[PDB]
Each structure stands twice: as structure tokens, then as C-alpha cells.
Subunit: 190 residues, 2 copies
């Protein structure tokens, strides 16, 4: 059904990462991300878009982690990656622009973003395009200088050299507060 | 904690799969597998061990998918929602009839943290080995390796590769764990008879 486009996508990503990761690794990234998201979103017609965005962001994080690439890298984890971590990631990138790279993930991803998140967000001028629930993966953790867990519990490998923060909390309000402080603090630690 | 242990396992696996897969692939295999399991099972002191087992099985599946393993036996995969009941039952019953004559795998769309305790107890009571089993998510490498892929209520989560037998064994509510084991056993018997004949 999507084999051909995934193959063509893999080919294009493999070219992009030519001297950095082999085609083999690239192939695996694309097919595994596809299946990984299918598990919670089901096979649908938008899936190859989501699989490619996920694989692409995961590869750049891996390249970051392996010193192959670089601004500060922040990761937000909640359970479903539909509400909380999505808001927190949207607000940070809103305030910080391209001075940070911000990602989010879930331990138990929902099939879609919560109806309200998009867009109480645009109603505050806040960009949230190409947002989807996605599973937590290792590469994005390795990449991160800062990891903010938000009710997921103990799902995250503790890598040395990172700042791990736990945030126990419509709810966009409180998050807003904490994201502004966070950014202030991140910006200041450079 | 586990990061350093995981590093040791990747080094060892790098060297074992040298000539076959890129070290970069091998290293992702172990850490991604760990993180995958951690999502549903949580960090516990034995997560590194289950991750190593899962990675090693996954790398073998990928070796097979790509014809890097000579004379493979038939490869069968069962898939249900939580990889705690249905697929674990089916997988253990087929290994129990077939032994070394097939490689059997299972997986879930939404793994539980552990096998259903009653599954463990009932299979145990009738002498079916089920001991190193654990719920794990569906991954692409094991689909590619598989000659038979059997679906048991997971929904449309599984890509449809050519060269394979796709079987669907769940076309309100459900029966007692007891009865599901019996229905599945009946189906596993026919599947095993059929597999034996078709080779």
C-alpha cells in the first residue's frame, strides 16, 4: 500500500544523509517509524507523511547526539503526547524561535492531538503545524540537553550530561508560565 | 544505570553482526528496543535483559528478511492488541507442537507491561512452556522475516508485504481465558498441519 513511497522516501533521505548514516540505517528508520506510528494511528492515508516527518526529525537528533552536526535541544514527554507535551513543545518553540530545537513524545501515544489544543493555540497566535502523537524513542533522548517529563512516570533512560525536569501540573495557563521560565533559564545557561 | 550496560551489549552485538549489518544499525537496535519496552513496561532492573533478547530476535528476523541466514525454517508471526493473551497463547502453542521446525514470534499494537497471569497459569497447567515471553510492540523487521502473519484483533496496523500468508483469526466482548485458549489451540492445530503439508 505504502511500500513504494516509503522506498522512494528512504532513497531521498539516504541521499540527504550521505556521508553521515548508511542507506541501511536510513531504510530501517523509515520502515520502523512507519510501523511504529501505525501501531497507534492505524494505517491511513496521511501516515507516510507522518512517518517521514518522524523519521527525519529522529535522524537529525541522532546526528546531533553523535556529534555529526547546533542549538540547545529540548524534549517534553507526557503519556499520550496529545495534550500536555504538545502544548509545552508548541509554546517553547513559539517563545524561543530557532534558538532551540524542541521535540515531544508519549509513552502511550493517542491516535490524534486533543481537539482543543489545535487551536486554543492559533487563537493565541501560536504555531502548531505538522503536530502528531509519537512514541518516545532513544535518539531524541540522546540528542536532548533538557528532558521535561510530565506525568509519564519512569519511561526515560537516564543519560548523564542532561538536565531532567519533572513537571507535575485550561492547563495551557500553568504550562505557559513554566515554559517562559524554562526558556529564560535555558537562554541564560549558554 | 542502564546506559552503560546497554553500551556493553551494543559493542558485543556490533562485533557479532560484523559484515552483516552496520554498527550504527546494531547500536540503534539495542537502545531503540530498550526504549520501546520501557514505554509500556517501565524502567525496571531487568529491562536491559529483555531489551537484549528482543534486539537479538529482531536482528535475526532482519537477517532472515534479507536472506542472510541459510535454510531458514518457516517463520510465523502472531499479532493481537496487548501481546499479553491471544498472540502469546497462539505463539506458545505453535512452538509446543512444532519445536525447531518453525521460528514463531508475537507482538502487540499496544503492549501491556506483562503477560496475563492466567495465560501463564493455564498454559503452565497443561505443560506448555511460556517462560521467557514478554509483551513487545510490533516492528517491521519481524513482519518482513515472516512467511505467515496472523492477525488477532489488532486492527489495520500491519503493513501488507507480498510473498507472505496473511491470515485473520478474528473477523460482542470475548470468552473466558480458558475458552480462548481452547479456540486458539484448535486453530493452531490446523495451521501446524497446514504448514507441515505446504513445505
Amino acid at each position: 500500500l505504502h511500500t513504494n513511497i516509503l522506498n522512494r522516501i528512504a532513497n531521498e533521505l539516504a541521499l540527504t544523509y550521505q556521508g553521515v548514516f548508511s542507506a541501511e540505517t536510513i531504510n530501517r528508520y523509515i520502515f520502523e517509524s512507519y510501523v511504529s506510528l501505525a501501531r497507534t494511528a492505524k494505517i491511513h492515508t496521511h501516515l507516510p507523511i507522518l512517518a517521514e516527518g518522524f523519521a527525519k526529525d529522529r535522524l537529525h537528533a541522532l546526528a546531533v547526539a553523535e556529534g555529526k552536526v547546533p542549538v540547545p535541544q529540548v524534549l517534553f514527554i507526557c503519556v499520550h503526547n496529545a495534550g500536555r507535551s504538545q502544548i509545552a513543545s508548541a509554546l517553547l518553540s513559539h517563545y524561543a524561535g530557532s534558538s532551540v530545537e524542541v521535540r515531544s513524545a508519549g509513552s502511550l501515544p493517542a491516535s490524534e492531538i486533543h481537539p482543543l489544543v489545535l487551536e486554543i493555540l492559533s487563537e493565541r497566535g501560536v504555531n502548531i503545524s505538522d503536530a502528531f502523537p509519537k512514541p518516545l524513542t532513544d535518539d531524541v533522548i540522546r540528542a536532548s540537553d533538557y528532558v521535561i517529563t510530565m506525568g509519564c512516570g519512569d519511561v526515560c533512560p537516564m543519560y548523564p550530561g542532561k538536565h531532567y525536569l519533572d513537571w507535575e501540573l485550561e492547563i495551557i495557563e500553568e504550562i505557559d508560565g513554566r515554559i517562559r521560565e524554562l526558556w529564560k533559564s535555558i537562554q541564560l545557561s549558554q
